[PDB]
Structure formats: C-alpha cells, structure tokens
Amino acid sequence: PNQSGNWKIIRSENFEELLKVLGVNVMLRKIWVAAASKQAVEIKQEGDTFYIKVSTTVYTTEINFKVGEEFEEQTVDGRPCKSLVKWESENKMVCEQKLLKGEGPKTSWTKELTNDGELILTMTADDVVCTQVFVRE
Numbered sequence: 001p002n003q004s005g006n007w008k009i010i011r012s013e014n015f016e017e018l019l020k021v022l023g024v025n026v027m028l029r030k031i032w033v034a035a036a037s038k039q040a041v042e043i044k045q046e047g048d049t050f051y052i053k054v055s056t057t058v059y060t061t062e063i064n065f066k067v068g069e070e071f072e073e074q075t076v077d078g079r080p081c082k083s084l085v086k087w088e089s090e091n092k093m094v095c096e097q098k099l100l101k102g103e104g105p106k107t108s109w110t111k112e113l114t115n116d117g118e119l120i121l122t123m124t125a126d127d128v129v130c131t132q133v134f135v136r137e
C-alpha cells in the first residue's frame with residue numbers, strides 16, 4: 001500500500017525535544033520548529049525503492065533508498081550517516097542509522113501509511129521520539 005504522493009504536515013510532536021538531545025543551538029531550534037509546521041514532503045515509491053524530498057525555507061533534503069540495502073544520508077542535525085531500512089510490518093518501515101564519523105545519540109526513523117490515509121513519521125534520538133503526521137495535499 002503505496003506512500004507515493006505530496007504530503008502536508010498537520011502535527012509535529014517533540015521535535016524541539018529531539019533537537020535538544022541532538023545538541024542543536026536554541027536559536028536554531030526555534031527557526032527549525034517554526035519551519036517544521038510549513039514543510040512540504042514529496043514521496044515516489046516503486047515497490048521497495050523510495051525517493052523522498054523534504055522541503056522548507058531553511059532546510060531541504062533528498063533521500064534515495066531501496067528497502068534492505070545500505071545507503072548514505074544525514075542525521076536530523078546534518079551529520080552524514082550509514083542507513084538501512086527494513087519493513088517492520090506491512091505498512092511501516094524502520095531505519096537504523098550509524099554515524100560515518102564520531103559519536104552521538106543513537107538515531108533512527110520510522111515511516112508508516114495508516115489505514116485512514118495519514119503518513120506518520122517518527123524520528124528518535126536516544127530516549128526522545130518525535131512524531132510528525134501528514135495528510136495528502
């Protein structure tokens with residue numbers, strides 16, 4: 001059941017708390033928290049192959065992966081990492097991340113398309129879980 005589409009954010013929970021764990025400067029946190037409620041997300045899914053574009057005025061990223069194959073992306077705070085996505089269930093994928101260089105909080109993300117048509121993203125750093133909920137444009 002396919003996640004392709006243009007998605008608009010409706011709620012963002014614990015994003016500032018996540019940025020705190022990641023050590024992001026407070027003045028930057030305020031800007032990023034504001035931008036998080038205005039983001040645009042585009043997904044192109046063909047089976048296990050994904051393209052994801054996340055766009056805001058301060059931050060934009062493009063993610064490319066196939067489920068089950070290691071790939072490179074960045075942590076939320078911008079550090080290059082090695083990632084691997086697996087299906088946890090029919091509708092929900094989970095990504096484990098490992099920094100290329102250095103140490104820091106354990107980070108991961110999940111993405112799920114629900115029965116009622118919401119896309120739910122979670123992003124985790126150590127004990128803090130941020131949840132962002134999207135609906136189709």
Ligand SMILES: *C/C=C(C)/C=C/C=C(C)/C=C/C1=C(C)CCCC1(C)C
Pocket residue numbers: 032033035036039052054055056058059063075076077109110111121
């Ligand atoms: C599967 C969906 C993924 C992996 C989405 C990742 C989205 C981000 C890493 C978003 C990051 C943002 C910032 C770093 C600051 C501006 C607000 C966000 C939420 C767009």
